[PDB]
Scaffold this active site. Structure first.
Site, PDB file in Angstrom:
ATOM      1  N   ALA A 173     -31.753  71.682 -17.254  1.00 30.36           N
ATOM      2  CA  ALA A 173     -32.308  71.350 -15.959  1.00 30.36           C
ATOM      3  C   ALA A 173     -31.213  71.458 -14.886  1.00 30.36           C
ATOM      4  CB  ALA A 173     -32.913  69.979 -15.996  1.00 30.36           C
ATOM      5  N   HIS A 183     -40.491  61.676 -17.274  1.00 31.80           N
ATOM      6  CA  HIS A 183     -39.482  62.501 -16.640  1.00 31.80           C
ATOM      7  C   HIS A 183     -39.452  62.175 -15.143  1.00 31.80           C
ATOM      8  CE1 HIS A 183     -39.592  65.179 -20.250  1.00 31.80           C
ATOM      9  NE2 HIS A 183     -40.896  64.893 -20.228  1.00 31.80           N
ATOM     10  N   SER A 229     -29.972  64.574 -17.045  1.00 32.18           N
ATOM     11  CA  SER A 229     -30.863  65.697 -16.719  1.00 32.18           C
ATOM     12  C   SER A 229     -31.717  66.003 -17.950  1.00 32.18           C
ATOM     13  CB  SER A 229     -30.065  66.914 -16.337  1.00 32.18           C
ATOM     14  OG  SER A 229     -29.427  67.484 -17.498  1.00 32.18           O
ATOM     15  N   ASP A 230     -32.784  66.782 -17.731  1.00 34.86           N
ATOM     16  CA  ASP A 230     -33.462  67.409 -18.830  1.00 34.86           C
ATOM     17  C   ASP A 230     -32.655  68.631 -19.300  1.00 34.86           C
ATOM     18  OD1 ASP A 230     -35.538  67.973 -20.751  1.00 34.86           O
ATOM     19  OD2 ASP A 230     -37.156  67.549 -19.263  1.00 34.86           O
ATOM     20  N   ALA A 231     -33.177  69.309 -20.332  1.00 38.97           N
ATOM     21  CA  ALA A 231     -32.466  70.329 -21.119  1.00 38.97           C
ATOM     22  C   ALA A 231     -32.399  71.657 -20.351  1.00 38.97           C
ATOM     23  CB  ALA A 231     -33.192  70.511 -22.429  1.00 38.97           C
TER      24      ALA A 231
END
Ligand SMILES: *[C@@H]1O[C@H](CO)[C@@H](O[C@@H]2O[C@H](CO)[C@@H](O)[C@H](O)[C@H]2NC(C)=O)[C@H](O)[C@H]1NC(C)=O
Ligand SMILES: *[C@@H]1O[C@H](CO)[C@@H](O[C@@H]2O[C@H](CO)[C@@H](O)[C@H](O)[C@H]2NC(C)=O)[C@H](O)[C@H]1NC(C)=O
Ligand SMILES: *[C@@H]1O[C@H](CO)[C@@H](O[C@@H]2O[C@H](CO)[C@@H](O)[C@H](O)[C@H]2NC(C)=O)[C@H](O)[C@H]1NC(C)=O
Ligand SMILES: *[C@@H]1O[C@H](CO)[C@@H](O[C@@H]2O[C@H](CO)[C@@H](O)[C@H](O)[C@H]2NC(C)=O)[C@H](O)[C@H]1NC(C)=O
Ligand SMILES: *[C@@H]1O[C@H](CO)[C@@H](O[C@@H]2O[C@H](CO)[C@@H](O)[C@H](O)[C@H]2NC(C)=O)[C@H](O)[C@H]1NC(C)=O
Ligand SMILES: *[C@@H]1O[C@H](CO)[C@@H](O[C@@H]2O[C@H](CO)[C@@H](O)[C@H](O)[C@H]2NC(C)=O)[C@H](O)[C@H]1NC(C)=O
Ligand SMILES: *[C@@H]1O[C@H](CO)[C@@H](O[C@@H]2O[C@H](CO)[C@@H](O)[C@H](O)[C@H]2NC(C)=O)[C@H](O)[C@H]1NC(C)=O
Ligand SMILES: *[C@@H]1O[C@H](CO)[C@@H](O)[C@H](O)[C@H]1NC(C)=O
Ligand SMILES: *[C@@H]1O[C@H](CO)[C@@H](O)[C@H](O)[C@H]1NC(C)=O
Ligand SMILES: *[C@@H]1O[C@H](CO)[C@@H](O)[C@H](O)[C@H]1NC(C)=O
Ligand SMILES: *[C@@H]1O[C@H](CO)[C@@H](O)[C@H](O)[C@H]1NC(C)=O
Ligand SMILES: *[C@@H]1O[C@H](CO)[C@@H](O)[C@H](O)[C@H]1NC(C)=O
Ligand SMILES: *[C@@H]1O[C@H](CO)[C@@H](O)[C@H](O)[C@H]1NC(C)=O
Ligand SMILES: *[C@@H]1O[C@H](CO)[C@@H](O)[C@H](O)[C@H]1NC(C)=O
Ligand SMILES: *[C@@H]1O[C@H](CO)[C@@H](O)[C@H](O)[C@H]1NC(C)=O
Ligand SMILES: *[C@@H]1O[C@H](CO)[C@@H](O)[C@H](O)[C@H]1NC(C)=O
Ligand SMILES: *[C@@H]1O[C@H](CO)[C@@H](O)[C@H](O)[C@H]1NC(C)=O
Ligand SMILES: [Ca+2]
Ligand SMILES: [Ca+2]
Lengths: 754, 754
Positions: free
Chosen positions: B278, B196, B274-276
């Site tokens: 995020a 990440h 992006s992350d979930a």
């Protein structure tokens, strides 16, 4: 008649005039710290002329005098060094004369104040100023003109042994105490020494001198403000750089901090000295040069041009190569001239050239050192620093009647002084037992039992302590942490706090926790006093004892201060200067954590009957503080009214005055509350601290009365460091949280910067 | 026919041609992640045409398929979506189809490999590349063309729940594994997704998503290298940004990292998601915009121009405002164009426009997923990951005769898989008991007893376990940590590791430690297997047990792999990918600490009989690793000869080959050794890591033989980030330490850069 000798000439011209008469040897001498033992025999007091001659010529700018010797040893040998300078050198440049002052002048039989982590809990900067003034009077009596404080490092790493030497975890509180301490010291024309620049006290693994991870925004947001206050506003005449590296630049050799920030941005006018042996560390610890034989040139070339003006003793005196470097063309003379100029400028402004002699005569020392005014203040400041953590069913204050058990290693037999006290201090002062017996006199039976030794798991003593409790109406158990004086600390005697004593656990050591349990299990109401230099992690105490009291390392009046609170002559008023975690596993625990930290999910729990309740943050523990920054109870209850701001729509140049009425709902006794104001920048361009202490007021409220509290917020001080690393007060909303701790908010308001 | 459709046209021209035909709605649709459940009912598999039309129009670039459903639900609904794109849109832009692959394709009954923290201990990147190739085969079968790995985050914060998902604490090892995993995946024209980015896995207090303290030097020296290898060298087609802030800049919105470093320095040509949820975090956790109602514009303006191209689901789909922002003049169309271009270029390079369909027919899935080749590899890689920590008096390997007790919660009853496993995985696979019984057949009596429940302090089970041990010649006790599958993890079932499961202690939880003690006290030789996703702190085990084995979270073959080592069919060859501390109070514990850290004073010690021996670092504990990075024993002993370098005086363009002969002094057994090469930059201009793994080679050495091991060091990779934040290989000496662990050095040499 040289112009530099004339006090009507402007200081800058005096510096210029003196500097232009100096040889390169004389310039170097100003930048290398000497030591009184170069001419004074520490054991006999005999004087060594040749050593004074050498010290003056080679390391003559300033010298250290923090040796556990009689008064006259210091005063007579400081006098000889100043007379030698005046009568037996061409230029007569007076010496700066340096010792420690952290919580008292570091000489035998001077007044010992409570440790800094404790007097920060007073939230009483005016009283701390008064302390600093009396410390300067004691130091001044023997010819000292420089003291090695304040410490404006923050207690952000609880495993580190020097937590006790700080003013807590919070930038604002530390900055305010730093400012007041500096002002009180320099009111005597004694130099302060703001330390340790900068970002020192979050070492990796909690280990003494270990390197610090962090970025420039954290450095400017959290680490630097407390220095700014002592340096820029109180006008500190000196600074000590630190032992650590910060993101891999040594503090001692950081041009960005020591020159670009300290001088180009802040306009600092004076000098920076290394810490002790910190110059050698450039090679030896940090491996930035050859360690054997040590590359003295390389050390000098790293630290002096970076802006570290003066090399402290304790290392290899690497700065003796300055002359060689200049001759080789490797060091510009102007770098040397700037460092010397900084030292001389401080000396001129201190008044040293007009009055190089400080000391009073031998006949007056007893009238200036350990005066009743100093002793009285030690007790006042100590009692104001005590923090009431718990008090169930009015267990406190104790009645001065019946029978009282006094139990535990810290109750008696030695004084639990913090570090930075002189050898053998621990054999004088008021213990909790001394204090308690003095307060009750003939009105109560006191049943004393040691219970356990602090440094041993042995439970031999429990029976005698259980017996003492069982035949008493109430039990007072005094346990905690311990440190050592400057001799015993460095001789390696056992300790749980102090410089170079770091811990991997914050739980009570040895038999102390089991001792408390054995007393509580008698069913007698048990009051626990924590006597310590940092947080202790024992959450079971909060609700299994009758009351819980924190006294960070006491003054020489500690037991009196403590009994003043225990028996209610003083209504406890301390607030925590440092957050208490549930476990060493939960660190760090500072209240000012950036948004997105700390409050994330659900906490698990381990019940004392064995049941596990599984959570997420953490599986079986709690990252929330056991007790937060600013926490402290009273015998009295306080009811806050509506919070008011004098102005709602403001500019970055305005001041917002926060107002609130606080009522002492106790009809029978006066009580002191510390009203704390936290600012929240609600929406920011970068991630900022969730909330920040930005003002507070400690007020005494008569019984049944209401008092109006006004606290000013200068808007210019509520900004952040943006993505371009510029300080800005961005337009938009600022929350104001007003309360009794960093968590216990009793009212709020919002203002809008335009 | 349009140029974008023509495979002979250069990729950049295909992107230009396609982008020029897209409406702003079509552009938006590429940058917003969809979800297969927009047209597939998760529980019934029923298709919703309206929902596919909407998903395709609004969030059609790529979609997630990580649901625990039958194979045909995934394949038939992926087909529907690709067919709809091709036949029922103007442009026919194939979708990227995303799932998880961390240690196996995330679908029921696919091959489960051991967890990444474990397979890193294999130090076998070629074998991990085989694993990634089989994973891609399995994923590809169902129409998946994108997998959300590798994780190249480092395990530098051991309290953090996702330690198990990393390849350990070391930049070099994580970089090499990341490269190989990426290459394996993308060999199938399946996109990797390097995550990440960047600096995610040192969260404050170890809490999931909490912010990270660090400077730019630490970021470039330690965090970024592993990303560089996968992205720049393995050609990864996608990156996922992180949930954290680093020194107060959100990862999702950091222009310096996402654009200046990733594009302007590294030349990265593809896209970042992006992350979930995020995206929402910018307002909701970081407080950089209004949370309620969420300021979708402000989120979009923060993350998209920063270089975060694609907004993942799990948030408020703030990117739907892209169109309004372009209309208002607040977002330059060129920013959008760049972001879409990044996505299209990946798709063209993946071959999607020439082959949008991946999937194999239903009848072949059983020949492509969970093949014997994949199952065998899972057992081979798992067995190569097992780390022998102790073995006294040849307790190991065990005889396949006599009686053997198999004890403990992790020995049987459930498979102890790590996280990123699909619902109900835990009910299939080989448990330690299963493996041990298969290994001995009728040749030994197996006496099983659970002993305790992992989640309980109840000791009811101990007497049965004690009896089982006492009637056996040797006892095997399997304890440790546990996580949960993707359903049970987020439903809140109890765990001690996994995403959003963080700990404030690394000691064995519940009855596990007392279980071990009870068995040991039996006097039967006791072998402890740690079955876990991170370090466990139980130092007393090293010398109070007959042997000590680490198996990080197993493959579905875990029990066979474990038995393979225990009975000596495989000579254990694993080396620790992450350092083991004595205590959670000692963190952090990474082997690559900057000079001046870690090695500071003397350690104290608490003896089991209660005697306290006080030290300094720490008073009563030890900051040194219980077991260091790279530690692992064998049944065989290895004797290293002299280290030689092919070149001693070199430049930055050269490669230094390290050579050493390693002898297997064991007369009876083949043995595998991992030769590790650590480089020391002896004298540096800034402070650097004390030592760094820069090369290794895992070699099988026949009994009694000697083997030449050669390891190349590319000099250009041995540099630092100087005070101007430039990467430089400074002239001077570099030490080369050659050994069996980061601590067990068997030979060394020096070369000199000019
Ligand atoms: C008086 O002072 C001088 C300090 O200069 C002492 O001279 C040193 O003697 C020591 C050991 O005998 C040598 O290591 C140093 O090189 C000398 N230093 C210098 C600069 O001379 C002298 O020993 C002192 N005498 C007494 C009685 O203390
Ligand atoms: C500290 O230093 C300053 C500088 O010497 C002193 O100020 C001078 O005070 C003398 C009094 O002897 C006056 O005659 C001068 O007019 C003052 N000079 C300046 C620049 O103010 C000051 O008195 C000293 N303060 C203390 C507390 O000792
Ligand atoms: C901790 O330090 C104390 C000193 O303050 C040690 O106690 C002394 O120990 C020796 C016995 O070895 C005695 O002769 C002294 O009388 C003791 N002094 C006091 C004041 O009790 C103590 O042993 C140390 N403890 C540990 C575990 O190291
Ligand atoms: C099929 O697809 C559409 C999704 O587009 C579903 O419609 C949504 O209905 C939900 C709740 O029933 C609303 O909250 C959304 O606003 C609708 N979205 C849109 C844009 O229409 C429809 O419910 C689905 N039907 C199924 C699976 O039965
Ligand atoms: C992955 O994708 C590339 C690009 O689509 C495939 O390579 C093309 O294959 C054709 C014949 O099928 C060749 O004639 C082309 O020259 C290739 N193009 C390029 C750019 O190399 C490749 O074969 C695919 N690989 C796999 C394993 O499917
Ligand atoms: C931890 O999780 C387990 C499930 O793995 C819990 O045990 C289940 O408890 C449920 C609800 O009471 C029972 O219906 C199941 O039969 C239990 N399963 C097993 C294997 O016994 C367990 O109670 C949890 N423990 C704690 C302390 O949270
Ligand atoms: C288990 O015992 C071994 C052997 O006694 C310990 O390893 C020794 O550790 C000491 C530290 O006191 C080293 O100086 C020795 O050189 C080591 N000896 C050998 C032969 O390795 C080991 O530390 C013990 N482990 C634990 C966790 O206590
Ligand atoms: C101080 O004096 C004593 C004896 O009179 C002597 O033993 C000691 O070494 C002296 N130290 C120095 C440095 O002169
Ligand atoms: C402190 O006074 C005590 C009185 O016993 C004495 O032992 C010691 O000499 C004094 N210390 C100083 C520095 O005067
Ligand atoms: C210092 O100077 C004075 C002359 O002013 C002289 O009398 C004395 O002898 C000198 N002292 C030393 C130690 O040289
Ligand atoms: C003690 O009890 C109070 C009142 O119930 C509660 O709110 C507090 O959390 C408790 N403290 C601890 C440490 O458990
Ligand atoms: C122990 O305490 C927990 C916490 O309330 C409770 O639910 C449980 O039933 C108690 N168990 C026993 C063994 O008393
Ligand atoms: C402050 O500003 C707002 C306008 O933005 C206005 O509505 C409000 O009345 C003002 N409040 C005060 C207290 O003056
Ligand atoms: C899936 O269909 C079932 C009927 O079998 C229904 O209960 C459920 O709500 C449906 N899910 C969705 C998202 O429409
Ligand atoms: C996995 O196999 C089992 C049969 O043992 C079955 O219960 C389950 O539905 C299968 N899942 C998938 C996704 O094929
Ligand atoms: C998609 O286009 C095809 C080809 O014209 C047409 O036959 C089919 O009905 C369309 N499908 C949908 C779902 O609109
Ligand atoms: C406890 O063990 C230590 C280890 O040396 C020893 O010194 C002490 O005497 C032991 N206590 C006992 C067995 O007396
Ligand atoms: Ca704002
Ligand atoms: Ca070098």
């Amino acid at each position: 008649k040289p112009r530099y000798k004339d006090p009507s000439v402007p200081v800058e011209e005096r510096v210029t005039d003196l500097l232009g008469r100096m040889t390169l040897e004389e310039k170097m001498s100003q930048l290398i710290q000497g030591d009184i033992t170069n001419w004074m025999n520490e054991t006999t007091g005999e004087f060594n002329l040749t050593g004074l001659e050498w010290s003056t010529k080679m390391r003559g700018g300033m010298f250290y005098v923090g040796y556990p010797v009689p008064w006259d040893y210091i005063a007579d040998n400081v006098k000889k060094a100043q007379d030698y300078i005046l009568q037996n050198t061409t230029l007569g440049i007076p010496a700066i004369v340096q010792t420690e002052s952290l919580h008292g002048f570091l000489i035998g039989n001077a007044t010992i104040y409570n440790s800094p982590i404790g007097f920060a809990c007073s939230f009483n900067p005016e009283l701390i100023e008064k302390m600093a003034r009396l410390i300067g009077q004691e130091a001044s009596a023997l010819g000292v003109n420089h003291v090695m404080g304040p410490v404006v490092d923050l207690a952000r790493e609880l495993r580190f042994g020097r937590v006790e030497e700080t003013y807590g975890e919070d930038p604002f509180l530390a900055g305010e105490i730093g400012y007041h301490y500096t002002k009180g010291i320099q009111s005597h024309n004694i130099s302060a020494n703001v330390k340790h620049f900068v970002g020192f006290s979050q070492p990796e693994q909690g280990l003494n001198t270990a390197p610090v991870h962090g970025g420039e925004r954290y450095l400017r947001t959290t680490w630097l403000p407390s220095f700014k206050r002592a340096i820029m506003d109180a006008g500190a005449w000196s600074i000590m750089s630190a032992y650590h590296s910060y993101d891999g630049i040594p503090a001692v050799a950081d041009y960005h901090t020591l020159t670009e920030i300290l001088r180009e941005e802040w306009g600092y006018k004076y000098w920076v000295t290394s810490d002790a042996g910190a110059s050698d560390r450039v090679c030896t610890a940090f491996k930035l040069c050859r360690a054997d034989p040590i590359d003295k040139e390389a050390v000098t070339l790293a630290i002096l041009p970076a802006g570290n003006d003066v090399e402290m003793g304790g290392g290899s005196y690497n700065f003796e190569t300055i002359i060689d470097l200049v001759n080789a063309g490797k060091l510009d003379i102007e770098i040397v001239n700037t460092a010397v100029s900084r030292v001389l400028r401080a000396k001129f402004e201190m008044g040293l050239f007009e009055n190089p002699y400080n000391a009073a005569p031998a006949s007056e020392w007893n009238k200036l050192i350990h005066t009743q005014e100093a002793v009285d203040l030690a007790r006042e400041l100590d009692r104001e620093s005590i923090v009431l953590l718990e008090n169930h069913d009015n267990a406190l204050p104790l009645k001065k009647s019946g029978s009282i058990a006094v139990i535990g290693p810290m109750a008696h037999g030695f004084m639990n002084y913090g570090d930075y006290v002189v050898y053998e201090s621990q054999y004088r002062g008021v213990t909790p037992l001394d204090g308690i017996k003095a307060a009750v006199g003939d009105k109560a039976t006191i049943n004393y039992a040691q219970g356990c030794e602090r440094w041993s798991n042995d439970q031999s003593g429990f029976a005698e302590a259980v017996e003492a409790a069982k035949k008493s109406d109430v039990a007072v158990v005094v346990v905690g942490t311990w440190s050592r004086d400057q001799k015993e600390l460095w001789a390696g005697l056992n300790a749980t706090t102090g410089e170079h004593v770091d811990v991997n656990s914050l739980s009570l050591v040895g038999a102390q926790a089991p001792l408390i349990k054995a007393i509580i299990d008698t069913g007698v109401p048990t009051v626990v006093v924590l006597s310590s230099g940092k947080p202790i992690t024992e959450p079971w105490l909060s609700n299994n004892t009758a009351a819980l009291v924190q006294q960070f390392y006491p003054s020489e009046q500690g037991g009196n201060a403590l009994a003043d609170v225990l028996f209610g002559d003083y209504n406890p008023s301390g607030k925590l200067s440092v957050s208490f975690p549930h476990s060493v596993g939960d660190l760090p625990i500072y209240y000012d954590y950036l948004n997105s930290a700390r409050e994330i999910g659900d906490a698990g729990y381990i019940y004392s009957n064995g049941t596990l309740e599984f959570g997420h943050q953490y599986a079986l523990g709690n990252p929330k503080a056991w007790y937060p920054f600013g926490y402290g109870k009273s015998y009295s209850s306080f009811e806050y009214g509506a919070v008011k701001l004098d102005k709602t729509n403001v500019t970055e140049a305005d001041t917002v005055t926060v107002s609130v009425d606080v009522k002492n709902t106790d009809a029978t006794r006066e009580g002191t509350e510390v009203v704390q104001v936290y600012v929240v920048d609600e929406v920011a361009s970068v991630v900022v601290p969730n909330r920040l202490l930005k003002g507070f007021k400690k007020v005494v409220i008569p019984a049944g009365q209401t008092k109006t509290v006004e606290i000013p917020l200068k808007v210019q001080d509520l900004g952040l460091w943006n993505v371009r690393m510029k300080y800005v007060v961005e337009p938009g909303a600022f929350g104001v949280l007003v309360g009794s701790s960093s968590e216990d908010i009793r009212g709020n308001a919002t203002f809008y910067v335009q």
